[PDB]
Amino acid sequence: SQIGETLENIRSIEKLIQNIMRIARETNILALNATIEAARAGEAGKGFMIVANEVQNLSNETNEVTKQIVEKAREILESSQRSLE
Amino acid sequence: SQIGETLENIRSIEKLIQNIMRIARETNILALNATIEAARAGEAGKGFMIVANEVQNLSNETNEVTKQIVEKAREILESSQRSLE
């Protein structure tokens, strides 16, 4: 609990926040490599490349804040686990 | 009280990122509708459809993971609540 709960939590948030940290990397290409290459098919290449762009832009924003979770959440224990001290 | 700061320090992060349930969702819908059109368009440059579905998964992706962080970081409270004691 508490001093342990925190850990039982941080890890519960790490293995998960890392998951989002994963997607951020898969999308960073699963879409970037679909735009920088979308300029091959029909004339809609220039039209699709952009619609595919935004997909990442407002997507990365997740990590921007999502990672801001651990950044602080890790302090919880950093201080609560340290409260053990 | 940093531990007493966890009582909200993250509370913000969670709600600030919560913006995903809306903005991240947004991109999804906007694209999903672009799939309806990209489809009824033609057939030659179908290459824009073979990926117009990418987001359909990229989105439904952060879903199970984001539902996880909210489920997890919410534990800190249940624990810090005892902690604040």
């Binding site: 039209g47 | 059109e37 009824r40 368009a41």
Partner: protein, 139 residues
Amino acid sequence: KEFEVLSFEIDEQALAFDVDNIEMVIEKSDITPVPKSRHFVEGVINLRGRIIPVVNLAKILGISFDEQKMKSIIVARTKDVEVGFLVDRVLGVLRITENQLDLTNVSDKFGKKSKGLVKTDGRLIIYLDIDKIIEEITV
């Protein structure tokens, strides 16, 4: 005989045209105003690098209107003319056929504009005719 149309409403008023004359859809943005233009025109926008005029569709059929609800711009393409239509929310595809049609061009106002009126299990989806509708905006 299978028609593909773009479904969308204009204040509890459904409309739709064949995708044949459709380029894409965008949201009402920086619409540069064109001086001494024509009452039923909003202005011009920069799209893909060309200046496409944004007409006020709803303002043509003398129907409802709302500068606010008007958040969707429908870009068309005639034989060589390109025009955008500012309207409300959009739906998407819709399978049309000689079955959904219920011609009765003797029970309304503006005529030639609409080729007819279709019905989906009991809806207000009105079939428009971009060609003749645009022909009015031109020449």
